[PDB]
Design a protein around this nucleic acid. Structure first.
Length: 50
DNA sequence: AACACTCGTCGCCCAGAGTTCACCTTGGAGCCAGGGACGGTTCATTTGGGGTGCCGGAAACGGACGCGTACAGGCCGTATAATGGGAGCTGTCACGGATGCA
């Protein structure tokens, strides 16, 4: 499933589509620590992803 | 061994990336209405053409028909005198019985 299908807000889509994350399969493959590593990552994005 | 200087690190503070959320337009995509000319169809010619069955007959042609020639096979005759075969090579044994003689 793509991350857009999760019907989320501005920042998470922006910071994901620049770097080529297209699905939630790679997102569930990546752990919370491996996804929070990104510079200027929103804590609200962390909350919604968790 | 005693003494007086300059550099990451972090937080914090303001501006937009660019994204979402969310407002007006206008070229529509199509839907329908109307008008050819057009190509498909059909039907009048149209006499240009294919057509032909048979023949006078001319000439080939297939064969009959009669009459010559050709070797193949057959018949026939040869007048000094010429008057009874070469050849075969045979080392069996058993043995039953006829068999020409006993």
């Amino acid at each position: 499933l793509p991350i857009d299908d999760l019907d989320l807000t501005v920042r998470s889509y922006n910071c994901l589509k620049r770097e080529g994350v297209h699905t939630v399969g790679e997102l569930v493959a990546r752990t919370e620590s491996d996804l929070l590593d990104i510079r200027n990552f929103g804590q609200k994005s962390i909350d919604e992803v968790k």
